[PDB]
Amino acid sequence: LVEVADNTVDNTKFVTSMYNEILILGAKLHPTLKLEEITNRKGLTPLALAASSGKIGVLAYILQREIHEPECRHLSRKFTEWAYGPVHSSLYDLSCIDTCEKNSVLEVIAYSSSETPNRHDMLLVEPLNRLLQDKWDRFVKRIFYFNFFVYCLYMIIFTAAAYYRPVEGLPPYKLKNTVGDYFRVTGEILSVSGGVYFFFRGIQYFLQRRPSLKSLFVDSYSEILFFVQSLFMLVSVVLYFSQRKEYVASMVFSLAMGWTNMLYYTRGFQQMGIYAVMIEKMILRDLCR
Amino acid sequence: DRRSIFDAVAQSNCQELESLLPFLQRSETGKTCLLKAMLNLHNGQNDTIALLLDVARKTKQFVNASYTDSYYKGQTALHIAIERRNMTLVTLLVENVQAAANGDFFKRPGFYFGELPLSLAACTNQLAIVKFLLQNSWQPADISARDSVGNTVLHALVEVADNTVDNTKFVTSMYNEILILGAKLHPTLKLEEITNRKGLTPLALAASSGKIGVLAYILQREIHEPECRHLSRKFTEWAYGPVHSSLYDLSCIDTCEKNSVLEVIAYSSSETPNRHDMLLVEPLNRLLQDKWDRFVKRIFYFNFFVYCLYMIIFTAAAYYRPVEGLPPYKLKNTVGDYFRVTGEILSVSGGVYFFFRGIQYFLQRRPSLKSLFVDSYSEILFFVQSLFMLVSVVLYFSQRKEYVASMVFSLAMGWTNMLYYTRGFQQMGIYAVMIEKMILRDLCRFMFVYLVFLFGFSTAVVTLIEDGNSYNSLYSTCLELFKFTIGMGDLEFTENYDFKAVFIILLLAYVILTYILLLNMLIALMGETVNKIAQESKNIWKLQRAITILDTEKSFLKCMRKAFRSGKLLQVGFTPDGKDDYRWCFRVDEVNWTTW
Ligand SMILES: COc1cc(CNC(=O)CCCC/C=C/C(C)C)ccc1O
Numbered sequence: 001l002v003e004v005a006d007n008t009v010d011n012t013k014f015v016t017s018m019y020n021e022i023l024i025l026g027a028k029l030h031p032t033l034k035l036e037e038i039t040n041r042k043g044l045t046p047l048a049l050a051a052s053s054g055k056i057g058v059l060a061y062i063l064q065r066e067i068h069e070p071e072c073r074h075l076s077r078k079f080t081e082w083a084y085g086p087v088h089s090s091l092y093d094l095s096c097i098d099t100c101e102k103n104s105v106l107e108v109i110a111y112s113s114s115e116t117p118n119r120h121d122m123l124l125v126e127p128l129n130r131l132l133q134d135k136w137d138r139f140v141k142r143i144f145y146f147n148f149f150v151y152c153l154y155m156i157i158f159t160a161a162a163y164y165r166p167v168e169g170l171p172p173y174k175l176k177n178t179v180g181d182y183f184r185v186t187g188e189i190l191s192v193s194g195g196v197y198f199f200f201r202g203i204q205y206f207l208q209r210r211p212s213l214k215s216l217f218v219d220s221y222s223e224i225l226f227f228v229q230s231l232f233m234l235v236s237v238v239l240y241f242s243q244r245k246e247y248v249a250s251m252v253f254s255l256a257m258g259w260t261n262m263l264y265y266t267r268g269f270q271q272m273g274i275y276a277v278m279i280e281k282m283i284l285r286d287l288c289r
Numbered sequence: 290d291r292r293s294i295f296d297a298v299a300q301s302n303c304q305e306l307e308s309l310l311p312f313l314q315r316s317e318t319g320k321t322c323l324l325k326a327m328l329n330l331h332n333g334q335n336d337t338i339a340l341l342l343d344v345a346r347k348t349k350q351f352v353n354a355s356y357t358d359s360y361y362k363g364q365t366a367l368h369i370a371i372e373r374r375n376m377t378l379v380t381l382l383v384e385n386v387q388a389a390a391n392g393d394f395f396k397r398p399g400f401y402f403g404e405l406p407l408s409l410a411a412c413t414n415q416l417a418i419v420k421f422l423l424q425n426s427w428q429p430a431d432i433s434a435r436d437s438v439g440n441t442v443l444h445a446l447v448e449v450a451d452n453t454v455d456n457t458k459f460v461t462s463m464y465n466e467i468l469i470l471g472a473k474l475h476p477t478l479k480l481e482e483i484t485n486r487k488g489l490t491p492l493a494l495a496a497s498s499g500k501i502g503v504l505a506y507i508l509q510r511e512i513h514e515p516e517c518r519h520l521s522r523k524f525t526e527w528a529y530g531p532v533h534s535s536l537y538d539l540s541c542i543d544t545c546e547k548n549s550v551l552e553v554i555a556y557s558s559s560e561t562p563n564r565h566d567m568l569l570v571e572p573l574n575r576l577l578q579d580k581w582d583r584f585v586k587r588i589f590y591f592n593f594f595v596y597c598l599y600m601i602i603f604t605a606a607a608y609y610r611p612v613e614g615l616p617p618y619k620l621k622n623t624v625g626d627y628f629r630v631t632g633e634i635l636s637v638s639g640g641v642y643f644f645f646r647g648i649q650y651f652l653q654r655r656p657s658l659k660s661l662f663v664d665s666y667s668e669i670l671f672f673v674q675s676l677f678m679l680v681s682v683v684l685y686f687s688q689r690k691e692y693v694a695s696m697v698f699s700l701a702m703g704w705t706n707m708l709y710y711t712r713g714f715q716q717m718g719i720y721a722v723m724i725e726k727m728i729l730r731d732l733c734r735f736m737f738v739y740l741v742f743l744f745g746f747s748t749a750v751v752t753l754i755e756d757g758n759s760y761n762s763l764y765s766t767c768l769e770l771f772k773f774t775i776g777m778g779d780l781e782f783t784e785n786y787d788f789k790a791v792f793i794i795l796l797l798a799y800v801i802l803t804y805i806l807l808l809n810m811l812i813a814l815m816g817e818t819v820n821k822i823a824q825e826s827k828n829i830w831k832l833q834r835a836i837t838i839l840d841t842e843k844s845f846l847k848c849m850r851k852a853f854r855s856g857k858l859l860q861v862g863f864t865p866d867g868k869d870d871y872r873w874c875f876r877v878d879e880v881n882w883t884t885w
């Protein structure tokens with residue numbers, strides 16, 4: 001039933017309908033069985049498949065399902081907790097929306113390879129919007145701001161240790177007894193540590209997600225850039241112990257990338273996140289043509 | 290047992306009640322048994338309430354049962370009946386009205402409707418219930434009830450409006466019906482002036498909070514009924530053919546006890562949903578335009594001319610600043626120096642004037658801190674110019690030559706601030722509004738992004754240079770790369786670099802990313818924003834002129850306060866109380882061919 005849905009209003013109409021009728025029928029015949037958890041060989045719940053393949057209408061249905069019949073009230077995914085006047089307070093199920101056995105509906109929507117017809121539009125349903133906004137407000141705003149602040153410090157120290165690079169002779173260099181040179185070696189060590197961190201993060205991402213080769217610059221325009229900055233920093237690491245002065249021609253690139261990559265963080269601020277999105281899209285289309 | 294009877298009433302069966310009645314007679318929340326019966330009622334299936342009433346009467350102090358908890362403090366049975374549309378139940382309870390439900394819900398999610406059964410019924414789109422309650426025989430409901438904070442029935446009616454067409458529909462409707470009803474019951478009372486603790490008339494609140502539909506109603510209200518013609522706020526003075534000449538009330542639109550409707554609309558902090566759109570009603574537009582045409586156009590033009598003279602003299606006394614030595618300076622016997630000292634004195638006098646004006650404004654209005662640059666973009670600038678001028682005053686008697694670095698700033702600001710005056714000319718006022726909006730939005734966004742990019746690539750290029758003039762600089766390289774954005778960038782401005790290929794790749798990447806991509810993006814986005822605000826600019830300009838008029842009238846009450854009044858004092862019709870209706874009315878014209 002889900003597999004044949006095509007998002008067209010009448011198709012959504014009767015897919016939702018017949019889904020409901022078959023569900024209530026199976027409920028009446030077998031009050032003991034719970035059919036939804038039935039999963040195919042890929043192990044996808046009908047919700048999970050209706051969300052991964054991209055069928056939005058059936059998704060809005062399955063997340064907004066309710067039944068009053070006393071015998072089979074227990075199929076509902078929504079309830080109305082109370083109401084005094086025009087005010088209503090209702091519930092939602094989150095059966096495994098937020099966290100699910102192997103992949104919840106959110107985890108499937110977000111990490112969908114964009115071979116899915118429409119993932120961006122799909123977070124318009126009520127429970128998902130409310131859920132994600134709630135998580136942002138409560139306990140991840142602080143984490144994101146702290147991450148942004150740490151990256152600011154890393155760029156600052158990287159910049160101020162690149163600015164004063166030793167110029168006497170060739171690399172490597174002896175550590176003079178002065179205090180400023182000790183500060184500078186601390187700066188270089190923090191710099192390379194951050195570099196290796198980003199390098200590994202990139203490799204881990206590319207292992208978990210396993211992104212394609214024809215759509216890598218349209219699905220993840222940011223992981224590529226962070227990993228590339230890490231690569232340049234590490235090549236500088238390699239060529240600063242190979243007694244060679246060309247490391248700078250690499251390191252410089254990195255540093256520039258560094259500061260530019262800061263735009264990655266303007267998605268926590270809607271009114272600047274939309275601007276950074278426009279930059280990305282235009283660079284991919286219009287500058288290229 | 291209390292639990293047994295609770296289950297029985299929840300059971301919709303009277304067997305337990307009948308069984309326990311003879312035995313009972315022989316013998317935090319506190320929800321009432323009759324309240325429990327009514328609550329668990331479907332299609333009027335709860336009948337134990339009448340039996341409970343009969344038993345209580347056979348054995349006043351209980352028909353007035355109410356909550357005790359702070360969560361539902363004071364929840365009233367008659368209120369619950371109203372919530373249920375209970376004509377039978379409410380009529381029984383009343384026959385068997387000023388109840389104060391002072392709980393949390395009545396004061397996170399909740400519902401505000403007033404604290405009185407009458408108010409609740411009025412807040413529920415139920416008209417028969419209110420008719421009966423306000424004119425119930427056993428105890429009629431008094432309409433003039435005022436709650437703790439003072440929100441009467443009309444106050445709550447306005448307070449629940451939400452500008453949506455159907456909501457406006459029935460809020461206006463029921464407001465009208467309750468008004469005419471109170472008029473018929475009490476021709477002597479005038480309900481509108483009833484004000485809450487904040488002292489706001491229902492008009493004033495409907496305007497301050499932002500409810501436009503109710504506003505258009507209240508200012509365009511008329512009644513023909515002979516007994517209650519005296520509630521109208523509009524009249525039609527005469528009509529020969531398709532022509533009509535009508536009046537308007539101006540009850541306290543133009544000038545009111547503490548804050549009129551205009552004074553509230555204009556000075557609204559823009560936390561109000563929609564103030565710009567709100568001056569579209571007929572009497573307000575006509576009134577403000579009339580004031581502009583009659584006796585404030587001259588004042589505004591004269592003010593503009595005086596400011597022009599102040600800038601001119603300030604400019605010509607700054608131009609010839611003494612250069613011999615340090616400040617202060619001795620006044621040479623020449624005549625030009627006397628002219629110049631006159632110029633400086635006029636300059637500082639104007640400066641102190643603007644400084645005080647700014648302080649007074651900031652005391653009266655008391656503007657917020659998070660929205661100061663979106664509510665008043667002009668008072669800040671005038672006050673800031675005054676501040677710079679006064680710091681120059683301070684440092685010209687501290688034997689220091691740095692005063693100029695301040696004064697210059699001031700002077701520039703001065704001339705630019707002249708744009709403040711292009712609101713008396715619609716077709717230039719809209720242009721100055723666009724400048725303001727773009728400076729607040731688009732330059733800010735684009736400048737954070739452009740500084741990110743500029744600093745990134747400029748440290749990138751300085752970490753490469755060696756200086757082996759003085760391009761080993763973050764400031765001089767920051768310039769030499771900023772110039773690329775004014776079409777003056779030199780791709781080879783230094784040859785003190787180790788690698789030419791890297792240097793050129795970096796500069797090319799910079800030019801492509803900022804000059805070609807970003808800057809043209811800014812042009813495109815400016816196009817978008819202009820195409821969007823083409824009309825918001827007009828509305829904001831009308832509001833700017835309205836504020837100008839209000840300040841103009843307030844400041845010059847000293848010269849002729851009551852001389853130039855709106856409209857005239859007219860006698861429109863008779864009223865039963867005194868058989869005379871004298872009001873500061875405002876006449877307008879109109880036509881219509883479809884009506885005939
Ligand atoms: C990193 O995440 C994001 C970054 C950006 C902006 N960053 C860029 O456009 C990359 C520029 C690369 C040019 C560098 C050249 C070197 C060799 C000098 C927009 C959206 C994002 O999500």
Ligand SMILES: COc1cc(CNC(=O)CCCC/C=C/C(C)C)ccc1O
Nearest residue numbers: 667670698701705706708709721724725
């Ligand atoms: C003053 O009222 C208005 C003014 C303007 C135009 N004025 C400005 O944009 C201010 C420019 C400030 C830049 C000055 C920098 C100095 C340090 C040289 C538009 C609309 C208004 O209502």
